[PDB]
Amino acid sequence: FKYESAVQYRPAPDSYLNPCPQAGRIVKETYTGINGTKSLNVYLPYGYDPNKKYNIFYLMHGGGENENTIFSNDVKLQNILDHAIMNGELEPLIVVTPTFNGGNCTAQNFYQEFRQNVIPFVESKYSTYAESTTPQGIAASRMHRGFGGFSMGGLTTWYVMVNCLDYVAYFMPLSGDYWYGNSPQDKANSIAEAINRSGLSKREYFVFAATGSEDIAYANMNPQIEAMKALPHFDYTSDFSKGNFYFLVAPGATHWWGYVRHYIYDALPYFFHELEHHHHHH
């Protein structure tokens, strides 16, 4: 892997959509938190070794979907992850698919359950960079923790960002805008105030947004992206060795996981290299 400054949309080869012999294990989990008893899936990379430490990426489904959608026949994201890790395009990581369904949970308020229940449950059981899952242990491993999502799950992602910068450094909002404001500048300012309160430097948080040029999400995302670009908090470029903000728009892509899985193929290899604990040249 090498960073590009303006990475372009490129679908995974069609071969990546079929099962790979080097298949990561997908574990169905059940936990109880502030929204009652709920499930999530945990993708473990092929060769997962609990004596090693893995990057972790939490990835939210869209409206009318559930914690099983992303690894279902409708999406098959695990095949793409399996092929990309096997081919060395993507460093091995843990991918979690939770749900905003259940109890008092909504796409907007999921971050509260994420903080209190989901991180402690997943990262007590599986080997992340978290030494412990106290607030301190989670915060001290933030550079190795990412959140993303599609549509309503992209809205989850923006609310995770504004409320969880202490816990998460890498954000992948796909086809979803941040509902918090009466203008694009209010949206940008809300994110800027979150960043100000966090104390973090511009080198300590990263946003790879994406959508399709034929995805309705573009209408509200693009103005938000333009307003954020104007902030001093963001240096626009996909080269995260130099800046921290990018917006990939896939030509012709519609509001459909068939396209959105390719955004994760394009974007997820960009994550978790800044202050990484390996000696890599990107």
Author numbering: 16 to 297
Question: Would you copy out the relevant sentences from the publication that reported this structure?
Answer:
ID30A-3 (or MASSIF-3) is a mini-focus (beam size 18 µm × 14 µm) highly intense (2.0 × 1013 photons s−1), fixed-energy (12.81 keV) beamline for macromolecular crystallography (MX) experiments at the European Synchrotron Radiation Facility (ESRF). MASSIF-3 is recommended for collecting diffraction data from single small crystals (≤15 µm in one dimension) or for experiments using serial methods.
In a first experiment, we collected diffraction data from a Se-Met derivatized crystal of ferulic acid esterase with the aim of de novo structure determination using the SAD technique (f′′ = 3.7 e− at 12.834 keV). The transmitted white beam then impinges on a liquid-nitro­gen-cooled single Si(111) crystal with a bandwidth of 1.5 × 10−4 used as a monochromator for MASSIF-3, which delivers a beam at a photon energy of 12.812 keV into its experimental hutch (EH2). This energy on the high-energy remote side of the selenium edge was chosen in order to be able to use the anomalous scattering contribution from selenium for de novo phasing experiments. Data were measured according to a strategy proposed by an EDNA characterization at 100 K from a crystal cryo-protected using Paratone N and were automatically processed. Subsequent de novo phasing performed with hkl2map and SHELXC/D/E found all 16 Se sites (8 per chain), and automatic building with ARP/WARP resulted in a model containing 280 and 281 residues (out of 297 residues) for the two FAE monomers in the asymmetric unit which was then further refined using Coot and refmac.
